[PDB]
C-alpha cells in the first residue's frame, strides 16, 4: 500500500509537469532530466525549476513499505524556496530507517489565467471550511471550539496556528450562530511584498464580524516563523473602509481571506479568560 503525503489540492483538469521514481539508498542520485538532488542519512532534497509558462498546483509523494506511524501530527514534506503559484521550489523530505523508495508527481496549469479560488472555497461556505472538517459550536455561548486532531502550534499564550497539507490557518476572533457569508478575496504572487495591506468595505449591512486567513509560505528549518497579521487601528462603525495589514518575516506565495458578515456585532467579542495581559 504505502504512505502518502500531499501539498495542495488536485483537480481533474491538470497536466503533469513531471513524474519520476527514486531509490532512497543510492549515492549519489541518478540525474533525471538534468535536475539536482542531495541524499544523506536523514534528508532527501530536490531542486525543480520549470521552463514553460505555468503555475504549479499540487504535489504528491508516495513511500513504500508501510511503517507504523501516522502522517498528520508532524511535518515531513516541505519546500524551502518558492511554493504554490511560483514556478519553482526546492523540496525537502525527511526519511526513516525503513523507507527505500519514492514516487513523485507534479501538476500545474497555464500561467496567465490561473487562480485557485474555485477549489478552496468549497460548495457550502457556511457549513464547511477549506480543510473539510465542519464547524461545531457551543450551545450555551454560540462560539466555535478549537479543532484538535491536526498539527497545531502556539507562539505565546492565547494564540493558535494550525497546519494541514501545506496549508496554514489563523482565526481572528470568535464566530456566532447567525453570521452570513458575503464574499471571498484572493491575492496572487505578483502583488506580494515584505509588507502590504488590503481594503475591505464595512458599509451598513456588510459589517465585518469574522476573518480567517489561509496562506502558503516557505520555511528555512522545520520550525516556522509565523507572520504578524494585526488589525490596523480599530474598525468601528465610523470608519467605513477598513484595512488589513500584513507583516511577514518570510515571503509568502498565496493568500485567501473569507470575510463573514453580521449586522448585530458591536465590534468587541472576547472570552472571559483571554482578556488580561
Amino acid at each position: 500500500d504505502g504512505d502518502e503525503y500531499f501539498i495542495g489540492k488536485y483537480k481533474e483538469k491538470d497536466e503533469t509537469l513531471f513524474f519520476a521514481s527514486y531509490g532512497l539508498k543510492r549515492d549519489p542520485c541518478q540525474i533525471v532530466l538534468g535536475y539536482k538532488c542531495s541524499n544523506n542519512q536523514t534528508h532527501f532534497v530536490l531542486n525543480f525549476k520549470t521552463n514553460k509558462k505555468s503555475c504549479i498546483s499540487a504535489i504528491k509523494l508516495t513511500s513504500y513499505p508501510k511503517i507504523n506511524q501516522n502522517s498528520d501530527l508532524t511535518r515531513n514534506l516541505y519546500c524551502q524556496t518558492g511554493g504554490i503559484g511560483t514556478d519553482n521550489c526546492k523540496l525537502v523530505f525527511k526519511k526513516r530507517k525503513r523507507q527505500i523508495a519514492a514516487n513523485i508527481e507534479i501538476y500545474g496549469i497555464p500561467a496567465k489565467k490561473c487562480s485557485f479560488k474555485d477549489r478552496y472555497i468549497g460548495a457550502d461556505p457556511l457549513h464547511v471550511d477549506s480543510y473539510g472538517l465542519s464547524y461545531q459550536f457551543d450551545q450555551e455561548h454560540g462560539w466555535n471550539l478549537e479543532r484538535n486532531n491536526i498539527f497545531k502550534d502556539t507562539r505565546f499564550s492565547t494564540e493558535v496556528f494550525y497546519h494541514k497539507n501545506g496549508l496554514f490557518n489563523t482565526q481572528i476572533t470568535y464566530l456566532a450562530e447567525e453570521d452570513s457569508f458575503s464574499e471571498a478575496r484572493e491575492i496572487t504572487a505578483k502583488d506580494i511584498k515584505k509588507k502590504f495591506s488590503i481594503i475591505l468595505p464595512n458599509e451598513e449591512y456588510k459589517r465585518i464580524s469574522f476573518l480567517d486567513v489561509y496562506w502558503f509560505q516557505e520555511t528555512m528549518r522545520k520550525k516556522p516563523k509565523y507572520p504578524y497579521i494585526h488589525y490596523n487601528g480599530e474598525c468601528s462603525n465610523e470608519n467605513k473602509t477598513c484595512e488589513l495589514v500584513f507583516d511577514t518575516d518570510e515571503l509568502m506565495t498565496y493568500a485567501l481571506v473569507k470575510v463573514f458578515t453580521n449586522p448585530e456585532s458591536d465590534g468587541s467579542r472576547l472570552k472571559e479568560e483571554d482578556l488580561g495581559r
Binding site: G23, L24, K25, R26, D27, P28, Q30, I31, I100, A101
Partner: protein
C-alpha cells in the same frame, strides 16, 4: 630482507593513469584522469608510503545510467561482471601471491546498495597500527549523532568473549 614494493594497478575501465612502471618504489605518485562525459569520484593523486598501502580512497569514474552505482575496481584486483541493474552480481579476484580480504560476490539489492564489503587483498608483511584499529572498532561498534549506542525500546545486548589457551604463548595464566 629486501625493499617494500607497493602493488601495481591491474585494470582500469574508462580512464587513464600516469605514469607506468613494472614496480613502484616508496613515495611514488600516480594520477588518474578519465574520459569525456563521465565523472570522477575519489582521489586524483595517490602515493604509497612505508606501510605498503596507497594513501586515500579508490578512484571511480561513473556515467550515471544504472539502478545501482558503479562499484569500481580496487587497486590490485580484477572484476568480472558488467550489468548494473536489479538482481545482478559482480565477482572479484586478484593476482598471484596475494590473499583476499572481503566479499567474493556482490549483489545489487532492492534499495540500490550492494551486499557485502569492498575487497582489497593483502600480503604477508602488512600489519595494522593501533590508531586505525581503535578508530575502526569505535566506528563499527557505535553510531554518531557525539557518539552514542542505539537500542530499540526493551532492547538488550549480549557480549560473548572467546579466548584460546593453546600452546601459542604460554605466558603465566592469561596475563595481558
Amino acid at each position: 630482507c629486501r625493499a617494500i614494493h607497493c602493488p601495481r594497478p591491474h585494470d582500469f575501465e574508462n580512464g587513464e593513469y600516469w605514469p607506468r612502471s613494472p614496480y613502484y618504489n616508496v613515495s611514488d605518485e600516480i594520477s588518474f584522469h578519465c574520459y569525456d562525459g563521465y565523472t570522477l569520484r575519489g582521489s586524483a593523486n595517490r602515493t604509497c608510503q612505508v606501510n605498503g598501502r596507497w594513501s586515500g580512497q579508490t578512484a571511480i569514474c561513473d556515467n550515471g545510467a544504472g539502478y545501482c552505482s558503479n562499484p569500481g575496481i580496487p587497486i590490485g584486483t580484477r572484476k568480472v561482471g558488467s550489468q548494473y541493474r536489479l538482481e545482478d552480481s559482480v565477482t572479484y579476484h586478484c593476482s598471484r601471491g596475494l590473499t583476499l580480504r572481503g566479499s567474493q560476490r556482490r549483489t545489487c539489492q532492492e534499495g540500490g546498495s550492494w551486499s557485502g564489503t569492498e575487497p582489497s587483498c593483502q600480503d604477508s608483511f602488512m600489519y595494522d597500527t593501533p590508531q586505525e584499529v581503535a578508530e575502526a572498532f569505535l566506528s563499527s561498534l557505535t553510531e554518531t549523532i557525539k557518539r552514542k549506542i542505539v537500542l530499540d525500546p526493551s532492547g538488550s545486548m549480549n557480549i560473548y568473549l572467546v579466548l584460546d589457551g593453546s600452546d601459542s604463548i604460554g605466558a603465566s595464566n592469561f596475563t595481558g
